[PDB]
């Protein structure tokens, strides 16, 4: 009957079109801040001196980019890991020159996507569900925090964060391979098994349900009209799908339990993305992937090359050409 | 037929890529199985008795007093950073040279008195206490000559 | 017959206590006698480079590839 | 008749031993950069 209790009843109401909740009190202002700043910076933002060497990189559509080449460029290397809000910048043009919008978007996005995760817990609690959908969303949240926050922290600069652009993402990937050999890191290998396996199991589970649908339609209408929303009966023969996949490989290698099967669909990509998020987070502190350069040696002592050595020649080509004016000394220790 | 070495027991063992030959490949005894170095006995080229090692430590002790004596010239000014930098720029090698020359039991207790006064000079310089730096700097000097007057 | 009741029977382990170590030894002898280098043409650690050839041997002809390889593997 | 956990014990001890030899062989002999 009080004013706060009527506000609490509206915030936690499951009858709103979108659930707000108390995490939405952090989710909606931070993500709409980051969305507003991203759209304005992607369309029209002046070039950013990313490498701190007064060589400004254009990233917006009004400075000659397209959708692929356009980016919100990371902060200046001269800033480093320093906090650069607008009020610490003496003019907005100085803030725009030094890659200020990147720090505003990334910090509001990472706060807002952690609050999106807690909002996913919160609605499940108000709906009487089991809680752990937001644990599955923690795997892309850990990945976003690794490339936007954790890898800047270990390298000591927001300039080494992943650019908010399509071609900036590929620039982030190639320099990471030259400096950390992520392909030879087993945590990226588990991540590739997470997304190759996850899209395998998605196409596998989606095939066997669609293969074993029960006749409820004619040849003229769509097959999806055989399902009614809110029906209690099963819409596909799971015995027929188990008998198919049990004959495709062999019988003992197939889930007859649909609850164990859907748990395996949740676990395989999420654990795979968790591990590759802890690959980026541990290559942030330069615990790099496997180095097998000049490891095969013949009897005289000469180096016999392997495929890791040919991979090393491609790593050498990226690292001698990346940030080509930024280096003054023979080791890229940053 | 290829060269074999089960760890050191079966086969060659004294081959260029055997990794678990702990000391069995070389003739001279190692410091430990987990080492590549021989011990610190004789046949080592480093002689700790040597005159150029002692003279390097004595030259640190002599120049320490020269750096310790330009402390109050920073304290009639107020360059407190120059006091803290003087105690650490050249004088970083002083604790290594003083403890190397402190062999007897009275040398060690006469050395820590110099060390306590050196930390009183530093702590008063962070606190910017002007009289306390100079009152510690003369105690650091007077404990330095007492250490060098022994030997 | 079920699977796990086979490998727990002692008759299975009477047969496979002889056959499995004999195949493991025979795989070991395939390497120890140096036969696998002669079957597949893999260089031993002695013979990546020879006294005449200090370079990496490549095949540069398609139809005399068998005869070019015989000249590169004579030493 | 053998207990099934006893087979998985010595079977897993054989897999541990063989993978220990494969990781030892990465530090010794060929491919060890030595």
């Amino acid at each position: 009957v009080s004013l706060w209790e009527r506000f609490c009843a509206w915030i936690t109401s499951t009858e709103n079109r979108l659930y707000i909740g108390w995490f939405g009190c952090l989710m909606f202002p931070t993500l709409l801040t980051a969305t507003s700043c991203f759209i304005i910076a992607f369309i029209a933002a002046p070039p950013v001196d990313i490498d701190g060497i007064r060589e400004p990189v254009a990233g917006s559509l009004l400075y000659g980019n397209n959708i692929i080449s356009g980016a919100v460029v990371p902060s200046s290397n001269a800033i480093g890991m320093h906090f650069y809000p607008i009020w610490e910048a003496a003019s907005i043009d100085e803030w725009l020159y030094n890659g200020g919008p990147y720090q505003l978007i990334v910090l509001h996005f990472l706060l807002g996507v952690s609050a999106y995760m807690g909002r996913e817990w919160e609605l499940s609690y108000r709906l009487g569900m089991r809680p752990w959908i937001f644990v599955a969303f923690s795997a892309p949240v850990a990945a976003a925090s690794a490339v936007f926050l954790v890898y800047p922290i270990g390298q000591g600069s927001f300039s080494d964060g992943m650019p908010l652009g399509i071609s900036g993402t590929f620039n982030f990937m190639l320099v990471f391979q030259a400096e950390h050999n992520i392909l030879m890191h087993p945590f990226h290998m588990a991540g590739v098994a997470g997304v190759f396996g996850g899209s395998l199991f998605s196409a596998m589970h989606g095939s066997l349900v669609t293969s074993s649908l029960i006749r409820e339609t004619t040849e003229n209408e769509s097959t999806n009209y055989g399902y009614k929303f809110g029906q209690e009966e099963e819409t596909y023969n799971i015995v027929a799908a188990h008998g198919y996949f049990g004959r495709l490989i062999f019988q003992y290698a197939s889930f007859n339990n649909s609850r164990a099967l859907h748990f395996f669909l949740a676990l395989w990509p999420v654990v795979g993305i968790w591990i590759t998020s802890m690959g980026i987070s541990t290559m942030a502190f330069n615990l790099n992937g496997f180095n097998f350069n000049q490891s095969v040696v013949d009897s005289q002592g000469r180096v016999i090359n392997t495929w890791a050595d040919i991979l090393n020649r491609a790593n050498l080509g990226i690292e001698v050409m990346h940030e080509r004016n930024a280096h003054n000394f023979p080791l890229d220790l940053a | 037929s290829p060269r074999f070495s089960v760890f050191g027991l079966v086969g060659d063992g004294t081959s260029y890529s055997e990794g678990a030959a702990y000391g069995t490949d070389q003739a001279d005894k190692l410091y430990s199985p987990y080492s590549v170095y021989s011990p610190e006995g004789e046949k080592s080229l480093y002689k700790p008795d040597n005159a150029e090692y002692l003279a390097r430590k004595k030259a640190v002790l002599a120049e320490t007093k020269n750096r310790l004596q330009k402390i109050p010239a920073y304290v009639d000014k107020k360059e407190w950073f120059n006091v803290k930098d003087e105690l650490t720029r050249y004088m970083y090698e002083t604790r290594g040279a003083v403890r190397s020359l402190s062999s007897s039991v009275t040398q060690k207790e006469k050395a820590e008195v110099f060390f306590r006064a050196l930390e009183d000079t530093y702590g008063a310089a962070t606190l910017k206490k002007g009289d306390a730096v100079k009152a510690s700097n003369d105690k650091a000097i007077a404990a330095l000559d007492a250490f060098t007057a022994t030997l | 017959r079920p699977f796990s009741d086979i490998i727990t029977s002692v008759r299975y382990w009477i047969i496979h206590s002889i056959t499995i170590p004999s195949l493991f030894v025979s795989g070991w002898l395939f390497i120890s006698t140096g036969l696998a280098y002669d079957v597949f043409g893999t260089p031993r650690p002695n013979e990546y480079f020879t006294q005449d050839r200090q370079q990496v041997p490549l095949v540069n002809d398609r139809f005399s590839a068998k005869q070019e390889l015989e000249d590169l593997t004579k030493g | 008749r053998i207990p099934l956990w006893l087979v998985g014990l010595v079977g897993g001890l054989a897999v541990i031993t063989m993978l220990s030899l494969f990781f030892y062989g990465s530090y010794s002999g060929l491919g060890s950069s030595l």
Partner: peptide, 28 residues
């Protein structure tokens, strides 16, 4: 009889694993 379907995989596997285990003790 299901012998030569599992033994087509198991017999070369134990032969190959005996070879790879012998390869760990080959030195240059």
């Amino acid at each position: 009889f299901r012998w030569l379907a599992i033994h087509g995989l198991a017999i070369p596997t134990v032969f190959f694993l005996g070879g790879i285990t012998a390869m760990q003790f080959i030195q240059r």
